[PDB]
């Protein structure tokens, strides 16, 4: 069996929902913004926002929504998670003690079901009599808000429509009302449905049925004063109600999908509209009063206000001031103004928060020499993309460097004093049958610029037809310096080749230090590339040389440098070339049992090897055969997402569910077969999705060595920004913290009741495990913040049975004295 | 696809067994020793009549690929039980047909399985497997006999005797040839036939076609009197050697 | 006969081992490809060095019945082969003997398991046409596969599906009853009847575990998932209906019936749960899944169903792979 330790050393920092209510108290406004597992309590101000409180949840917040039932003072909180754990939360303050209560709890979760396309949707009723769920195809799922239902439970009204976009309850309706847009063969359209709770179905919609645009994405329910609701698409902004039908076509919003909508004016007069390249609209619904006093809506006006960062969510706070939530960004306030800057613009920003945005790669490297250690990640996307630079010193300080592209790996070659970053950015087709971008960037702003020339590819006579308007993505290696972090130089990649594999290394007996990209040429009708290319590169003198090239028939998803010889995963193969005296790849050995070779890492002469389905392969070079060898492969099924070498007899891996797991030799050598079955002795759910796994540690060092309980570090990189931290123990430490963790988990009370076994168990949509082999660290570390008695009524009856001597009792500072010793690791 | 195992009479002159200086009167002795002993072991282990002729096919199979001077017919022949066992779901243990192998022989000839019996039998499968080419499932007379019987309608009693009579027949057919030479399907056929003639039945008036004379025709296609005469000639020869007088 | 029937003279030198694959019936399954040729074979080691009863009874049942088995929905064994073999020492010689299969791209259960593939209706109609063909052709002639699970039926990139591993199957007789294990399927698929202990059972079985795998493949999550084999019988129950001597009459004669009791009579919510699925398919599962074997569908009127019977063949079509999604979950 194997024991691993996992903390976390940056909490998630994309927003994945933002609500503003009035739930602490039924005077101030409040703004709840919504991390993965994290929820974080504001205030709002003039100024800005007070933070008030943050909790954690044993779950991801899937739906967080804010209500005031009938006979309430103020708004309460309902949240379901991913894994279908459902609640409605209270906040309580007794002077300086601040808590949340869990007023209700439930999993509302069916043993059979679909799970949906466009996700979990949840939506609360106007008169807030019931929470309506849509989690599965052909079901719609109520919980009705009855004061005793605080086992929340509910029950499925079968729907006729099985692929829904997106659902709301409508406003101004005689009874609960949902209007719906959903995907049939015969294209898009919006229905209406009435939800009896007494009869426990569906009754006849109040307005019919309306054909609408086949890339229709949202529904906004219109407030009362209007009623009905307005459907955004691609190209039209539609509203329904009734016999009325109003339909703006704007050219404006053709350009970037909308992505967030959100209401300022509460008459429904203004909305608030976002697309995928930081644009922020706003939609006014001009009104007409007919002499019968009763008011209609005249027309719709999309207007432009300016440039925000890629937003998943827009929420207006009063006053002019607007959050912006991003995932892909740094989140922000900004200043609605009613008149213009010089530059055309009514939008300011008033303040930025750091959003470590997608981490699609990131290296460890110590600049200064200080020894410590610091983490430069390629982080965020299109026009936020940057990279970051973090460094331990209580907080982490960070450092920004915009790059307004996407970056995509990252390594640091020491004899250049520089960094080499993969790049791309988006052009469209313009009228000149070329491309244009619609910002300049990294690539484009480079001091000096290079453009691939090879003719390798330049075999087809014809070229494939753009038609204008059309995405492109434009592949670069970016030069970087590792004091200033100036883009020195850009090499551009051939049209559609991607540059997927980065490398710094020496090869063979060749002194130069090389930067080598992998690449594959990516056409639309391909549905696995079937060319690609690795080039060798020497940066010398300001200047990027073009040293020798390979032609390969597949995509190099992945390089990695092997005892001087260069490994790549090539489509379904793993090669090994050698670097020639005369400066060329020449291939020794191949092996091709794999699907997707998407991830490789090496130690020694052993490899690891990453599929998109058939988990992790070992594999050795086999010096004297001259030929790879599969030593042991994880029989279990999984999708990875990146993989790591622990140990000689330990690997670890993360799956496409936000699951971890940790692989080893049976090291018991009974029959071959049993030392070929790599066994899974580490299961554990870390409900983030881990892109880069990396050796090494920020912690500031001098000469400290092996007081540490831990042994190894490893760091990694998550979609939510989150950066962890895996380490090994040894079986004693092992069973003291897994004991204490039982221990904890009976004293601890979790936000809405949620079982944290089950939170870390193992779950894929067909699996649920135990998690095994893994202590939560950030379950042992909060040990130092429970009470005092909550801490001796932890450490009562405790006696630790290491091993090489007896069980010996547990005293409360002794085990405080660990805790504050396994928070220095991070 | 599937192997050939089926010969020509003028072809077992070429035996192993024939070329290194056995006569063919003692092939066939050989033969009739070793397929009875398959046959008086499993009779009494109480193995159904299918598993004994699996058995004994496998053994007349065997003595085509190789010489009885080399391999001791009965070990083969406890080898053949063995397997055939396993085959059509009728196992037993090696030590048990080792046992009931001891009882029905003598001192000489429990010898040839040495001084390990089971050794030297559970030795010997992995030659017999690779003889018989792994080619497993075989068909018996038996199937057939009741096959076709079952389309005769007439007197319940001249039939019944008739079968009896086929059948016997057929259990007698094991101790030669003839498992070699031609399908279970038209020994079935030739054994009606040699019953028919001595019970001095006329089988066509059983069939639903009372008047074609050659009424074996609906059940195999293609098989001239020449052949059904040449396997009654070659079962009743056994008969006349030993001198016992037909079943009837 | 002149070559392709001469079996178990070969030896293994003629394959180069690629590693292996998976855990079969009895043995670990192994990836080679034949020198000669180059083929993609796959091998199943039988070891004779266990001398109790020499070669194994149930390899060579998988040998008997794997051999009289052609159909283009079934494995097909290429050939046997064998370790070096000593000349002359055949006596000492303790070489073991290798199964040879072909080779098929995937696994259902690596394709599903993992979540990258997508059926449409059409693509599960490829599938469950295909299967029930080779199914009924065993069950035709007689054979009972007592292992239908994910890891058993394999498919190629084409779109032909095809059944494998036959060293759990045995055959069957109507008229005579020889007494088979009460405990044979994957418990996640295992027919009722044989979790209520019936040692003598019907070609039903496997019916009923292609059933469970029909809306699998609609729900994307396996129908049953239980630990225990009383979990399992309260979880069929919820769905297909408490065993009841109503839609049962010989449950009284089961071994446990009263011993194995689910907690409440519940009825039969099988159309109301699966209402998503389309009317055809539902129909199909609903025999499929019906708890008293003498009333479960059998394969041929599985392949005579409004869902099955006017499929094509020609319209093969293959599960739906993702693309540049395997690299990168789309950011847009
Ligand atoms: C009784 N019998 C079986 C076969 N038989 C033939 N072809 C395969 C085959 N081919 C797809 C395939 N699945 C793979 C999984 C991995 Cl991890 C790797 Cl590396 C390569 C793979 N190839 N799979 C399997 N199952 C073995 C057990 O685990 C599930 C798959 N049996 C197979 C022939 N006779």
Redesign the pocket.
Same mark, same amino acid.
Do not use: C
């Given at each position: 069996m194997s024991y691993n330790y996992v903390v976390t050393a940056q909490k998630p920092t994309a927003v994945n929902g933002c609500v503003t209510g009035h739930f602490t108290s039924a005077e101030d406004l409040n703004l709840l913004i919504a991390k993965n597992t994290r929820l974080e309590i504001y205030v709002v101000t003039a100024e800005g926002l007070r933070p008030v409180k943050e909790v954690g949840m044993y779950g991801k917040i899937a739906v967080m929504e804010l209500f005031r039932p009938k006979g309430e003072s103020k708004d309460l909180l309902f949240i379901l998670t991913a894994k279908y754990n459902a609640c409605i939360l209270e906040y309580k303050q007794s002077g300086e003690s601040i808590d949340i209560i869990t007023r209700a709890h439930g999993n509302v979760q069916d043993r059979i079901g679909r799970p949906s396309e466009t996700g979990i949707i949840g939506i609360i009723d106007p008169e807030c009599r019931m929470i309506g769920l849509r989690l599965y195809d052909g079901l719609f799922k109520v919980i009705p808000l009855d004061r005793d239902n605080k086992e929340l439970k509910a029950f499925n009204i079968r729907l006729e429509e099985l692929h829904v976009i997106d659902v709301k309850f409508l406003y101004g309706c005689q009874a609960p009302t949902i209007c719906f847009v959903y995907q049939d063969p015969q294209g898009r359209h919006v229905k209406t449905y009435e939800v009896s709770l007494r009869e426990k179905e569906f009754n006849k919609g109040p307005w019919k049925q309306e054909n609408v645009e086949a890339e229709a994405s949202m529904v906004i329910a219109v407030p009362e004063p209007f009623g009905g609701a307005i459907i955004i698409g691609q190209e039209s902004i539609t509203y329904h109600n009734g016999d009325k039908y109003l339909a703006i076509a704007p050219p404006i919003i053709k350009q970037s999908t909308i992505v967030c909508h959100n209401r300022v004016d509460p008459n429904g007069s203004r909305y608030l509209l976002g697309d995928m390249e930081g644009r922020l609209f706003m939609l006014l619904l001009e009104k007409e009063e007919q002499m019968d006093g009763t008011v209609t809506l005249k027309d719709l006006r999309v207007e432009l206000l300016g440039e925000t960062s890629i937003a998943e969510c827009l929420t207006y706070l009063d006053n002019g001031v607007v959050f912006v939530g991003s995932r892909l960004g740094d989140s922000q306030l900004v200043k609605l103004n009613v008149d213009s800057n010089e530059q055309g613009s009514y939008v300011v920003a008033m303040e930025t928060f750091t959003n470590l945005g997608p981490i699609v790669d990131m290296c460890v490297v110590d600049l200064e020499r200080q020894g410590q250690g610091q983490l430069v990640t390629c982080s965020g996307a299109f026009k936020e993309g940057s990279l970051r630079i973090i460094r331990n010193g209580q907080k982490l300080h960070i450092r920004t460097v915009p790059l307004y592209e996407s970056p995509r790996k990252i390594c640091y070659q020491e004899v250049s004093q520089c960094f080499g970053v993969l790049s791309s950015r988006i052009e469209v087709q313009d009228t000149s049958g070329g491309t244009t971008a619609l910002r300049p960037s990294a690539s484009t702003q480079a001091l000096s610029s290079s453009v691939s020339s090879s003719k390798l590819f330049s075999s087809s006579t014809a070229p494939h037809e753009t038609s204008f308007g059309e995405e492109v993505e434009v592949h670069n290696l970016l030069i970087i310096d590792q004091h200033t972090f100036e883009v020195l130089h850009a090499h551009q990649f051939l049209q559609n080749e991607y540059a997927l594999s980065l490398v710094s290394c020496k090869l063979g007996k060749d002194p130069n230090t090389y930067f080598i990209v992998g690449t594959a040429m990516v056409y639309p009708e391909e549905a696995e590339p079937k060319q690609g290319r690795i080039v060798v590169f020497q940066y010398s003198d300001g200047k990027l040389q073009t040293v020798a090239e390979k032609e390969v028939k597949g995509a190099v998803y992945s390089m990695v440098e092997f005892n001087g010889k260069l490994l790549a995963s090539i489509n379904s193969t793993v090669r090994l070339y050698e670097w020639t005296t005369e400066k060329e790849l020449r291939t020794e050995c191949n092996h091709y049992?794999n699907i997707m070779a998407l991830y490789l890492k090496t130690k020694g002469d052993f490899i690891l090897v990453g599929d998109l389905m058939?988990s992790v392969?070992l594999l050795a070079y086999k010096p004297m055969e001259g030929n790879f060898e599969e030593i042991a492969?994880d029989?279990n099924?999984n999708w990875m997402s990146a993989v790591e070498i622990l140990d000689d007899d330990n690997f670890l891996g993360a799956e496409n569910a936000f699951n971890l797991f940790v692989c080893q030799k049976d090291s018991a050598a009974t029959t071959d077969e049993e030392r070929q079955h790599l066994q899974e002795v580490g299961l554990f759910h870390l409900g983030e999705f881990v892109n880069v796994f990396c050796h090494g540690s920020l912690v500031m060092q001098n000469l400290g060595e092996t007081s540490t309980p831990t042994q190894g570090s490893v760091l990694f990189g998550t979609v939510n920004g989150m950066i962890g931290l895996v380490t090994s123990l040894s079986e004693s430490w092992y069973n003291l913290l897994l004991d204490m963790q039982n221990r904890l988990n009976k004293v601890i009370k979790s936000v809405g009741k949620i079982e944290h076994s089950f939170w870390r168990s193992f779950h894929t949509e067909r699996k649920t495990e135990p998690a095994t082999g893994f202590i939560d660290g950030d379950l042992i570390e909060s040990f130092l913040d429970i009470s005092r008695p909550k801490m001796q009524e932890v450490v009562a009856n405790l006696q630790y049975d290491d091993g090489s001597g007896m069980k010996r009792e547990a005293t409360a500072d002794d085990l405080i004295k660990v805790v504050e010793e396994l928070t220095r690791i991070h | 696809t599937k192997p050939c195992w089926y010969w020509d009479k003028k072809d077992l002159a070429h035996t192993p067994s024939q070329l290194e200086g056995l006569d063919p009167a003692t092939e066939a002795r050989y033969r009739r020793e070793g397929a009875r002993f398959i046959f008086d072991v499993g009779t009494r282990l109480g193995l159904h009549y299918d598993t004994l002729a699996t058995g004994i096919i496998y053994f007349h199979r065997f003595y085509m690929f190789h010489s009885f001077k080399q391999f001791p017919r009965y070990v083969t022949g406890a080898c053949c039980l063995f397997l055939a066992g396993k085959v059509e779901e009728t196992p037993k243990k090696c030590k048990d047909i080792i046992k009931t192998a001891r009882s029905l022989l003598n001192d000489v000839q429990f010898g040839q399985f040495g001084d390990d019996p089971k050794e030297e039998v559970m030795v010997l499968e992995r030659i017999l497997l690779q003889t018989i080419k792994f080619d497993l499932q075989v068909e018996h007379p038996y199937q057939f006999l009741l096959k076709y019987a079952k389309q005769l309608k007439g007197d319940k009693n001249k039939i019944q005797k008739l079968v009896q009579m086929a059948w016997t027949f057929v259990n007698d057919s094991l101790c030669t040839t003839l498992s070699l030479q031609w399908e279970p399907e038209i020994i079935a056929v030739a054994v009606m036939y040699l019953a028919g003639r001595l019970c001095k039945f006329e089988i066509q008036e059983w069939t639903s076609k009372p008047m074609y004379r050659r009424w074996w025709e609906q059940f195999v296609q293609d098989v001239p009197v020449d052949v059904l005469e040449d396997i009654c000639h070659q079962i009743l020869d056994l008969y006349s050697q030993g001198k016992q007088q037909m079943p009837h | 006969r002149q070559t392709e029937s001469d079996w178990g003279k070969r030896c293994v030198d003629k394959f180069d081992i690629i590693?292996i694959?998976?855990?079969?019936?009895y043995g670990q399954?192994y990836?080679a490809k034949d020198k000669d040729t180059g083929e993609l074979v !796959?091998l199943?080691k039988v070891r004779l060095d266990n001398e109790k009863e020499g070669f194994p009874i149930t390899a060579i049942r998988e040998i008997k019945i794997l051999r009289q088995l052609i159909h283009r929905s079934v494995?097909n064994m290429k050939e046997i082969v064998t370790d070096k073999q000593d000349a002359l020492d055949f006596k000492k010689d303790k070489g073991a003997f290798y199964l040879v299969?072909?080779?098929?791209?995937?696994?259902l259960?690596?394709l599903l398991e993992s979540g990258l593939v997508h059926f449409s209706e059409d693509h599960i109609k490829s599938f469950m046409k295909q299967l029930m063909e080779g199914l009924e052709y065993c069950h035709k002639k007689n054979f009972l596969h007592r292992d239908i699970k994910c890891?058993?039926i394999?498919l190629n990139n084409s779109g032909q599906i095809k059944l !494998?591993?036959?060293?759990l199957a045995r055959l069957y007789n109507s008229e005579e009853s020889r007494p088979y294990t009460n405990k044979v399927i994957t418990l996640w698929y295992r027919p009722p009847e044989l979790l209520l202990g019936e040692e003598r059972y019907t070609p039903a079985i496997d019916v009923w575990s292609c059933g469970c795998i029909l809306g699998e493949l609609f729900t994307k999550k396996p129908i049953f998932q239980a630990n225990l084999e009383l979990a399992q019988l309260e979880l069929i129950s919820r769905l297909c209906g408490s065993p009841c001597p109503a839609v049962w009459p010989d449950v009284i004669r089961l071994p446990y019936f009263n011993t194995m009791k689910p907690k409440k009579q519940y009825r039969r919510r099988l159309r109301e749960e699966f209402s998503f699925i389309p009317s055809a398919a539902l129909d199909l599962l609903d025999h499929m899944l019906t708890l008293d074997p003498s009333k479960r569908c059998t394969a041929e009127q599985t392949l005579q169903s409004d869902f099955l019977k006017d499929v094509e063949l020609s319209k093969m079509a293959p599960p739906d792979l993702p693309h540049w999604q395997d690299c990168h979950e789309l950011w847009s």
């Open positions: 049992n058939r392969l492969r029989f099924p | - | 590693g694959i998976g855990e079969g019936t399954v990836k !796959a199943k494995v299969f072909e080779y098929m791209d995937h696994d259960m690596g890891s058993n394999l !494998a591993d036959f060293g």
